[PDB]
């Protein structure tokens, strides 16, 4: 703090990789939710700020996170969106919970190091 963009990316990238590595759990999250394609027009009435792994990656790659907490906020946004919109025993919700478990384990030592 100040953070160099490429060093911040290098430090955080493993934690995002860890989420992508989860198969099948990352699959609903590797791309944006498209409510039009899905036929769920209610989605954006509940999820005001969509977030997904492809968007986090793009932002990590293009200097969009000045500070590590802005990345952490985006990961948590993606989770909270899925946990608010979906039934607790749904696939998406269960898969989300797994990514959150993985993320909590990966991020702690990285934030401390930064």
From Swiss-Prot:
Residues included from the entire protein: 1083 to 1196 of 2442
Domain Bromo residues, every copy: 3-110
Lineage, broadest ranks: Eukaryota, Metazoa, Chordata, Craniata, Vertebrata
Subcellular localization: Cytoplasm; Nucleus
Region feature (Interaction with histone): 42-88
Consequence when changing residue 44 to A: Impairs binding to acetylated histones
Oligomeric form and interacting partners: Found in a complex containing NCOA2; NCOA3; IKKA; IKKB and IKBKG. Probably part of a complex with HIF1A and EP300. Interacts with GATA1; the interaction results in acetylation and enhancement of transcriptional activity of GATA1. Interacts with MAF and ZCCHC12. Interacts with DAXX; the interaction is dependent on CBP sumoylation and results in suppression of the transcriptional activity via recruitment of HDAC2 to DAXX. Interacts with phosphorylated CREB1. Interacts with CITED4 (C-terminal region). Interacts (via the TAZ-type 1 domain) with HIF1A.
Involvement in disease: Chromosomal aberrations involving CREBBP may be a cause of acute myeloid leukemias. Translocation t(8;16)(p11;p13) with KAT6A; translocation t(11;16)(q23;p13.3) with KMT2A/MLL1; translocation t(10;16)(q22;p13) with KAT6B. KAT6A-CREBBP may induce leukemia by inhibiting RUNX1-mediated transcription.
Biological role: Acetylates histones, giving a specific tag for transcriptional activation. Mediates acetylation of histone H3 at 'Lys-18' and 'Lys-27' (H3K18ac and H3K27ac, respectively). Also acetylates non-histone proteins, like DDX21, FBL, IRF2, MAFG, NCOA3, POLR1E/PAF53 and FOXO1. Binds specifically to phosphorylated CREB and enhances its transcriptional activity toward cAMP-responsive genes. Acts as a coactivator of ALX1. Acts as a circadian transcriptional coactivator which enhances the activity of the circadian transcriptional activators: NPAS2-BMAL1 and CLOCK-BMAL1 heterodimers.
Name the record gives this protein: CREB-binding protein
Post-translational modification: Methylation of the KIX domain by CARM1 blocks association with CREB. This results in the blockade of CREB signaling, and in activation of apoptotic response. Sumoylation negatively regulates transcriptional activity via the recruitment of DAAX.
Region (Interaction with ASF1A): 80-98
Domain comment as written in the entry: The KIX domain mediates binding to HIV-1 Tat.
Superkingdom classification of source: Eukaryota
């Amino acid at each position: 703090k100040i953070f160099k963009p490429e060093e911040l990316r290098q430090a955080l990238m493993p934690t995002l990789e860890a989420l992508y590595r989860q198969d099948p759990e990352s699959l609903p999250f590797r791309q944006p939710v498209d409510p039009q394609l899905l036929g769920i027009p209610d989605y954006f009435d509940i999820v005001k700020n969509p977030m997904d792994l492809s968007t986090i990656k793009r932002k990590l790659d293009t200097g969009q996170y000045q500070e590590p907490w802005q990345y952490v906020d985006d990961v948590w946004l993606m989770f909270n969106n899925a946990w608010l919109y979906n039934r607790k025993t749904s696939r998406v919700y269960k898969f989300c919970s797994k990514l959150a478990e993985v993320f909590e384990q990966e991020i702690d030592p990285v934030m401390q190091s930064l």
